[PDB]
Structure formats: structure tokens, C-alpha cells
Amino acid sequence: GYGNQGGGYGGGYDNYGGGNYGSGNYNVFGNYNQQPSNYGPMKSGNFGGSRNMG
Amino acid sequence: GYGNQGGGYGGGYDNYGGGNYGSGNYNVFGNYNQQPSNYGPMKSGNFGGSRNMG
Amino acid sequence: GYGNQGGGYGGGYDNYGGGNYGSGNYNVFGNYNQQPSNYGPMKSGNFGGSRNMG
Amino acid sequence: GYGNQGGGYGGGYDNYGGGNYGSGNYNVFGNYNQQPSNYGPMKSGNFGGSRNMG
Amino acid sequence: GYGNQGGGYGGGYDNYGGGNYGSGNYNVFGNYNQQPSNYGPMKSGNFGGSRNMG
Amino acid sequence: GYGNQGGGYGGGYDNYGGGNYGSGNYNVFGNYNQQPSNYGPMKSGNFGGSRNMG
Amino acid sequence: GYGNQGGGYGGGYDNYGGGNYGSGNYNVFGNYNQQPSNYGPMKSGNFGGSRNMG
Amino acid sequence: GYGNQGGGYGGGYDNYGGGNYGSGNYNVFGNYNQQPSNYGPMKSGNFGGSRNMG
Amino acid sequence: GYGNQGGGYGGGYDNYGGGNYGSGNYNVFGNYNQQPSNYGPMKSGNFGGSRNMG
Amino acid sequence: GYGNQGGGYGGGYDNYGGGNYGSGNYNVFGNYNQQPSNYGPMKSGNFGGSRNMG
């Protein structure tokens, strides 16, 4: 792994979004159980005209 | 793995979106169980006219 | 792992969003249990015209 | 791990957001239990036109 | 681990947000128990046009 | 409607089971909704050698 | 409506089970909602060798 | 409506079980809501060798 | 409505179980709300060899 | 409404169980609210060999 050299803008190894959302659970249930899960909107990156050049 | 050299804009190894959404679960259920899951909208990247050049 | 060299903007290894959201749980339930979970909107990155150049 | 060299802006290994949100729990329940969890909006990064250049 | 060298702005290894929010709990319950948890909005980073250049 | 007259056992207008199980709902949903329903075993009547004569 | 007259056992208008289980709901939802419902076992009547004669 | 006249046992208009279990709700939800409901076992009537004759 | 006349046992208009369990609610929610409800076992009637004759 | 006349046991209009359990609520919520409710076991009637005859 070696980073960027150069560029008109700043080259970066930017991690915007990632990870585990409701993963790797170990559930052992008996009879009448309830387990709901809501994961809201994910916005990862550049929004609203960001990282713009003049 | 070697990064970008150059460019008019900044070359980068940008990770915008990724990961595990409701994966790798181990579920053992008995009889009358309920397990709902909602994953909201995923927006990964550049939006709203971002990373634009003048 | 080696960082960026140079760029018109500041090249960085910026981690904006990540992690575990409701992951790796060990749940052992009996009969009539309830376990809801809400994860609100995730905004990771640059918003509102940020990191702009003049 | 080696940091950035240079850039038009300050290259940094900035960690904006991360961590464990409701992860790694060990729950053993009997009969009629209730365990809700709400995680509010997550804003990680640069907002409101921040880190801008003149 | 080696810090940044230089930049137009101050390169730093700034940790804005992180940690464990409701993680690693060991819960053993019997019959009719209740355990709700609310985690408010998380704002980590630069807001309100901060870290701007003249 | 007139009840029974007589019998070796007691004649009765016994209602053992009945009613509405998940009926007459008015549901108006938008986009990504979830609504599961489990109705457990129904036992209506005489069980375990009941209402027996000597 | 007139009750029973007579019998070897007591004639009765016994209502053992009935009613509305999750009926007549008016639900108006938007986007990502979750509404599970579990109704446990229903036992209505005479069990365990009850109402027996000698 | 007229009650029973007579019988070897006591004729009665016994109501053992009934009513509304999670019925007639008016729910107006927006976006990411959760509403689980568990109704435990219903036992209505005569159990364990009750109302027996010698 | 007229009560029982007579019987070997006491004829009665005994109401053992009834009523509204989580019914007739008016819920107006916005965004990320949680409302669980557990109703325990219902035992209505005669149990354990009750109302027996010698 | 007229009560019982006679019987081997005492005829009565005994109300053992009834009422409203979590009914008729008016809830107006905003954003991230939590409202759990547990209703324990209901035992209404005659238990443990009660109202027996010699």
C-alpha cells in the first residue's frame, strides 16, 4: 500500500462510509419473540457541491 | 497496491460505500418468532454537483 | 502503508464514517421477548459545500 | 504507517466518525422482556462550508 | 506511526468522534424487565464554516 | 332462539371458540413497510377426557 | 333467547372463548415502519378432565 | 334473555374469556417506527379437573 | 336479562375474564419511535380442581 | 337484570376479572421516543381447589 503521488486536487485514501450494520448476530430464540431493526438513510461521500474548484 | 500518479483532479483510492448490511447472522428460532429488518436508502459517492472544476 | 505525497488540496487518509452498528450481539431469549433497534441517519463526509477551493 | 507529505491543504489522518453503536452485547432473557434502543443522527466530517480555501 | 510532514493547513491526526455507545453489555434478565436507551445526535468534525482559510 | 329441553348430560349453548383474528384491518402503507403477525395454536372445546360420564 | 330447561349436568350458555385479536386497526404508515404482533396459544373450554361425572 | 331453569349441575351464563386484544388502534406513523406486541397464552374455562361431580 | 332458576350447583352469571388489552389507542408518531407491549398469560375461570362436588 | 334464584351453591353475579389494560391512550410522539409496557400474569377466578363442596 502506497499513497497517491500528486494531482490537481488532493489525492487521498478517504474512507467515507463502511462498517457492519446489523451483522454477525448470534440469536437463539424460543417461541414468541420479536426483534425488529431499522437502519436510517446512509449518506457517505461529498454532498452539496463540496470539494469544488474555483 | 500502488496509488495514482497524477491527474487534472486529485486521484485517490476513495472508498465511498461498502460493508455488511444484515449479513453473517446465526439465527436459531423455535415456533412463533418475528425478525423484521429495514435498511434505509444508501447514498455513496458525490452528489449535488460536487468535485466540480472551474 | 504510506501516506499521500502531494496535491492541489491536502491529501489525507481521512476516515469519515465507519464502525459496527448493532453487530456481534449474542442474544438468548425465551418465550415472549421484544428487542427493537433504530439507527438514525448517517452522514459521513463533506457536506454543505465544504473543502472548496477559491 | 507513514503520514502525508504535503499538499495545498493540510494532509491529515483525521478520524471523523467511528466506533461501536450497540454492538457486542450479551443478552440472556427469560419470558417477557423489553429492550429498545434508539441511536440518533450521526454527522461525521466537515459541514457548513468548512475547511474552505480563499 | 509517523505524523504528517507539512501542508498549506496544519496536518494533524485529529480524532473527532469515536468510542463505544451502548456496547459490550452483559444482561441477564428474568421475566418482565425493561431497558430502553436513547443516544442523541452525534456531531463530530468541523461545523459552521470552521478551519477556513483567508 | 330457545334452549335445549333435557338430556342425559346438560344441554347447553356453549360457545367454545370464535371471534376475529387479524380481520377488518385498514392498512395504508408507503414504500418499505413490514407488518408480520403470528397467531398461536387455538384449542377450543373439551380436552383431556373432560365432560365424561361415570 | 331462552335458557336451557334441564339436564343430567347443568345446561348453561357458557362463553368460553371469543373476542377480537388484532382486528379493526387503522394503520397509516410512511416509508420504513415495522409492526409485528404475536398472539399466544388460546385455550378455551374444559381441560384436564373437568366437568366430569362420578 | 332468560337464564337456565335447572340441571344436575348449576346452569350459568358464565363468560370465561373474551374482549379485545390489540384491536381498534389508530396508528399514524412516519418513516422509521417500531411497534411490536406480544399477547401471552390465554386460558379461559375450567382446568385441572374442576367443576367435577362426586 | 333474568338470572338462573336453580341447579345442583349454584347457577351464576359469573364473568371470569374480559376487557380491553391494548385496544383503542390513538398513536401519532414521527420518524424513529419505539413502542413495545407485552401482555402476560391470562388465566380466567376455575383452576386446580375448583368448584368440585363431594 | 335480575339475580339468580337458587342453587346447590350460592348463585352470584361475581365479576372476577376485567377492565382496561393499556387501552385508550392518546400518544403524540416526535422523533426518537420509547414507550414499553409489560402487563404481568392475570389470574381471575377460583384457584387452588376453591369453592368446593363437602
Question: Could you write out the three-class secondary structure of chain J?
Answer: CCCCCCECCCCCCCECCCCEECCCCEEECCCCCECCEEECCEEEEECCCCCCCC
- Partners of residue E4 in chain C, C-beta under 8 Å: 3
Distance CA B1, CA H41 (A): 61
Cα torsion G13, G18, G20, G22 to 10°: value is 170
Note whether G touches H: 3 CB pairs or more under 8 A: yes
Give the closest-approach CA distance of A54 to chain B in angstroms.
5
Q: Which of C20, C22, B31 is nearest to A26 (CA)?
A: C22
Among candidates H9, H18, H46 on the partner chain, residue whose Cβ is nearest the Cβ of F10: H9
Sheet holding G20-21, edge to edge: F20-21, G20-21, H20-21, I20-21, J20-21
Chain centroid, CA H28 distance in Å: 29
**Exposed, middle or buried, D24 (CB in 10 Å: 0-12/13-18/19+)?**
middle
Question: What kind of experiment solved this structure?
Answer: cryo-EM
Q: Which of these, B21, E46, E20, lies nearest to A17 by C-alpha position? A: B21
Distance from CA of G35 to the nearest CA of C (A): 10
Which is nearest to F21 in space by CA: G15, H33, D32, G17?
G17
Sheet holding C37-39, edge to edge: B37-39, A37-39, C37-39, D37-39, E37-39
Grid cell, residue F50, equals 373432560
Contact C4, A3 (CB under 8 A): yes
- CA dist D31 and E32 (Å) reads 7
Least Cα distance to C19 among B38, F43, D17, J33 occurs for: D17
Q: How far apart are CA B27 and CA C27, in angstroms?
A: 10
Which cell numbers hold the place of E21?
A: 455507545
Strands in F42-46's sheet, in edge-to-edge order, are F42-46, G42-46, H42-46, I42-46, J42-46
In sequence order, the β-bridge partners of residue G26 are: F26, H26
Report chain E residues whose CB lies below 8 A from the CB of C40: 41
Cα atoms in the 13 Å half-sphere on the side-chain side of F11:
14
Question: Nearest CA to CA, how far is H35 from chain B (Å)?
Answer: 11
- From chain D, the residues in CB contact with A19 under 8 A are 18
